[PDB]
Write a protein that binds this ligand. Structure first.
Ligand code: HG
Ligand code: HG
Lengths: 184, 178
């Protein structure tokens, strides 16, 4: 829906409510087919019980899939997606969303309502119609230089860090929580 | 109202050989935080530009390991480019027309002297132009013109799994494929 330029705007009004969701065991190959077909580069990921566990983006594939050096059909997106799902509340002003994305090096994130349900996805493109020139440049620079901190699904507090081998391949992402023993 | 790209481009770009695997090329991108590489052949010719989107659209669908595919079959080709004397507004029109968010910049002689990205342009473009480039990058995809006839476009040929086997020229009068 056309709205014209405005300094303020609640995210809910500009987000994409027609977002697509995919299961967390979907392979990278099958997930990307959906992205290419729909010209949609952000998918919400759900586990087998309907819980929103992450967001799969182009950058997540470049940063977390390619380095594993495996065929796209051999890697479930749960190992690639941004997790926990990046998100902002539906009542956020575009300015607040910009700060959230920039802080996390993201160019898109999910939007959740008060009850916590995912109601849409908002991207830099959506925001570009309202943000200041400087804010847009900020998000762009932050997306190039920063990377989202993925948290451990086992303890929920540990940070998943890359473990490389001699070929530079990411063997696994290991939880940084001392009290936790998790690798994937 | 005016600003030529040569002034804002990045002449500090990185070049990789066209036989570099997707795996090695992406490692370079990730380590440098630069998601655009100029690709050259074995004789010093600038033959293409490897971008994130090119990997998502032309590498992933092949369902092959990153170390088994040379970037020459993935990169944008012919190489996306604008002349160094182009005004930023002209570059914006070029990127948008081609669904790109970055392209190479060449000098009179024709060699690549830099790379210009949407981020570089974001400081000199109107908000409308920036949004335009963003929209076009999502909705349009770069057209890989056939090198043999120059008019046909290379289209993916899929197998029963939806895996890309080759990119074949659309021109009926042409037999090119890669
Ligand atoms: Hg953990
Ligand atoms: Hg051709």
């Amino acid at each position: 829906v056309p709205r014209g330029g405005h300094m303020f705007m609640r995210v809910e009004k500009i987000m994409n409510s027609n977002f697509k969701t995919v299961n967390w065991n979907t392979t990278v190959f099958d997930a990307v087919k959906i992205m290419n077909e729909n010209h949609l580069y952000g998918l919400v990921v759900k586990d087998d019980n309907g819980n929103d566990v992450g967001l799969l983006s182009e950058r997540s594939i470049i940063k977390r899939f390619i380095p594993r050096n495996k065929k796209p059909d051999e890697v479930p997106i749960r190992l690639v997606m941004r997790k926990p799902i990046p998100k902002v509340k539906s009542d956020y002003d575009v300015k607040d969303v910009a700060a959230y994305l920039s802080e996390n090096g993201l160019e898109r994130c999910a939007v959740v309502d008060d009850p916590g349900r995912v109601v849409g996805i908002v991207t830099l493109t959506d925001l570009s119609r309202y943000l200041s020139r400087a804010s847009i440049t900020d998000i762009l620079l932050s997306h190039r230089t920063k990377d989202y901190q993925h948290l451990c699904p086992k303890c929920g507090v540990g940070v998943l860090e890359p473990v490389y081998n001699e070929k530079g391949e990411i063997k696994v992402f290991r939880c940084s929580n001392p009290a936790c023993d998790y690798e994937e």
